[PDB]
Amino acid sequence: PYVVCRQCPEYRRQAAQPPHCPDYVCPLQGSHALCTCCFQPMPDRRVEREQDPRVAPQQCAVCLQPFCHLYWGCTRTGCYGCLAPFCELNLGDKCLDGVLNNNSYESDILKNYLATRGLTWKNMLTESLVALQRGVFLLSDYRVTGDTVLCYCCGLRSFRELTYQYRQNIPASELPVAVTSRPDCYWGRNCRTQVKAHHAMKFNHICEQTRF
Ligand SMILES: [Zn+2]
Ligand SMILES: [Zn+2]
Ligand SMILES: [Zn+2]
Ligand SMILES: [Zn+2]
Ligand SMILES: [Zn+2]
């Protein structure tokens, strides 16, 4: 497939098939990869970077998919900045929405707790990443640190896990009594019924599956 990117030489551009009517420059033997976020081609320089750390990262260290943001700036509605060190990743203004269990009721409780104290999601992440570094909080992607260069989706996935642990560690005395009065759901954080508003309001889902 003929491909022309931001950094392709002019001669390449003028040789593409024409439309229908009613510092780096790409070498001949080089290749292109499509940004997983914006679908636009960029020169694929990952192999080069392996022995030259001077080349900007072009992939998420967690899912290994390519993203163009650190390399030359990605633009798309819905794109907040799709590749970054985790501690600096832009998760968007709505990242607290459904952050706990995809459960708006549980999530609103956390939003209220943070807003009451004038805290932002950023403050919560910073505190959570301190705990992560001490080994007090844990991640499924267990090798991720605040310094890992990762994408929006992988960062968000870990932010949900850190946030759940942050929530877990809030003393009951610091939450409204209407929150703490609710009995634990037998099925815990993975309950499938908590997507229904009534069930979500009735039971606490910040807990684990009941076993014995
Ligand atoms: Zn190119
Ligand atoms: Zn990723
Ligand atoms: Zn992009
Ligand atoms: Zn992007
Ligand atoms: Zn439940």
Side-chain angles (χ1 to χ4, degrees), residues 1-27 29-212:
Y2 204 79
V3 169
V4 183
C5 83
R6 276 187 234 175
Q7 293 181 334
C8 270
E10 261 286 336
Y11 65 94
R12 284 271 285 178
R13 201 220 276 248
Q14 306 307 316
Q17 296 307 307
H20 151 270
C21 291
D23 248 63
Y24 184 85
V25 178
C26 303
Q29 82 287 357
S31 56
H32 295 90
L34 303 183
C35 175
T36 305
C37 172
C38 68
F39 314 120
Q40 306 303 289
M42 63 184 173
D44 188 345
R45 304 178 64 186
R46 293 126 112 196
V47 179
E48 180 186 352
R49 177 167 196 268
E50 291 172 349
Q51 306 293 338
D52 187 0
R54 296 142 65 217
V55 188
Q58 286 180 303
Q59 75 177 21
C60 175
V62 176
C63 67
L64 307 177
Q65 299 316 296
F67 293 88
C68 78
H69 192 60
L70 288 175
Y71 184 76
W72 65 17
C74 180
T75 298
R76 178 179 65 80
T77 303
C79 176
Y80 303 133
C82 52
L83 193 67
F86 188 19
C87 64
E88 288 163 22
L89 183 70
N90 298 323
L91 290 174
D93 289 344
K94 297 166 186 52
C95 66
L96 291 184
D97 289 352
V99 71
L100 294 172
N101 304 344
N102 274 123
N103 177 324
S104 68
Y105 190 85
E106 295 290 356
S107 294
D108 288 356
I109 283 162
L110 175 66
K111 293 187 218 179
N112 287 344
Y113 167 92
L114 297 174
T116 291
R117 296 159 178 76
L119 301 175
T120 65
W121 68 261
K122 269 262 74 137
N123 295 147
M124 176 176 66
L125 181 52
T126 298
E127 192 175 338
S128 302
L129 281 175
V130 156
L132 181 65
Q133 219 216 232
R134 275 192 73 98
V136 178
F137 283 4
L138 321 173
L139 288 180
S140 292
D141 293 325
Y142 68 97
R143 306 188 61 184
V144 162
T145 77
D147 291 328
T148 304
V149 171
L150 42 56
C151 70
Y152 169 73
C153 294
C154 292
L156 186 59
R157 185 173 65 248
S158 287
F159 171 79
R160 284 187 236 108
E161 285 184 340
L162 295 172
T163 296
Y164 183 93
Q165 292 168 91
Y166 185 95
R167 167 62 181 82
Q168 247 187 322
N169 278 284
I170 305 179
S173 58
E174 296 300 356
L175 300 162
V177 67
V179 167
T180 55
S181 284
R182 293 144 64 251
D184 287 0
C185 179
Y186 186 92
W187 309 106
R189 55 194 297 184
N190 298 316
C191 178
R192 309 296 247 240
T193 315
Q194 69 190 300
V195 308
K196 301 188 188 183
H198 177 88
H199 186 79
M201 179 182 326
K202 187 169 185 178
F203 297 96
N204 168 48
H205 288 88
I206 312 303
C207 56
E208 302 292 318
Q209 173 64 45
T210 292
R211 294 190 144 82
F212 287 106

